[PDB]
Amino acid sequence: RVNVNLTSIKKLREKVDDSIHRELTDIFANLNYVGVVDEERRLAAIQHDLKLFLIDYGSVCYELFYQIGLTDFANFGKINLQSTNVSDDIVLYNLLSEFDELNDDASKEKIISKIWDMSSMLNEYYSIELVNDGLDNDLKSVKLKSLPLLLKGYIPSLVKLPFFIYRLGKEVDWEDEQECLDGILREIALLYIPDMVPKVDTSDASLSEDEKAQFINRKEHISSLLEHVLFPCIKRRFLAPRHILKDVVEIANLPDLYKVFERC
């Protein structure tokens, strides 16, 4: 185990401590999970004492993974992304090809160059391991071998990998130690948030049979993820920042409900 003697991490940990909302933190500490309301908008319902809340779990997982990243900095486990199938490898140049505005090989190469020069630290501090399969200068052959393992029983979806690389290469201020470190933790947290699952019409006979069971499977995987992995972690360690009050909304209360719903 590695002690973080770093001055940058401490300032960022203090910044989290200064934003902690005591009352909102108690709500998460004692949550009673109800279920998923919207997999697209990412709304989940929780019970706290006598109230029913609508939570934006996109926003909560964001702060949760950010907080986990801050705490386990330089001591992360790894999600080994490589199999025996070499064709399943994650090439950074291939990911950046999703961005039409990166209309030239050079602009994609610009992003990979920054990321690649910082591979020693990205690996050491974040467990973000990048490897080169050919000659060192071949940016088009730069690969993502490992990602940090933030939560046991959780493997993030890689649908957002293009955004992760694009933002690591364009949004992270590599010049300032603190801003750079904060930026990477934010990028890891953003990638780690469960995906937005758009609504698909199960009643529409016009939509194919294979597209149905596939939506149903994505719907199930999130419900299971939130219920068995995410909410138990949120309940156990989540510190609620005050900027999240807008993301937690009281929708019903038992005293009021029991004035309408009555025994036979």
Partner: peptide, 7 residues
């Protein structure tokens, strides 16, 4: 302290 990677 400060990071070796930022010099």
């Amino acid at each position: 302290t400060r990071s070796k990677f930022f010099n």
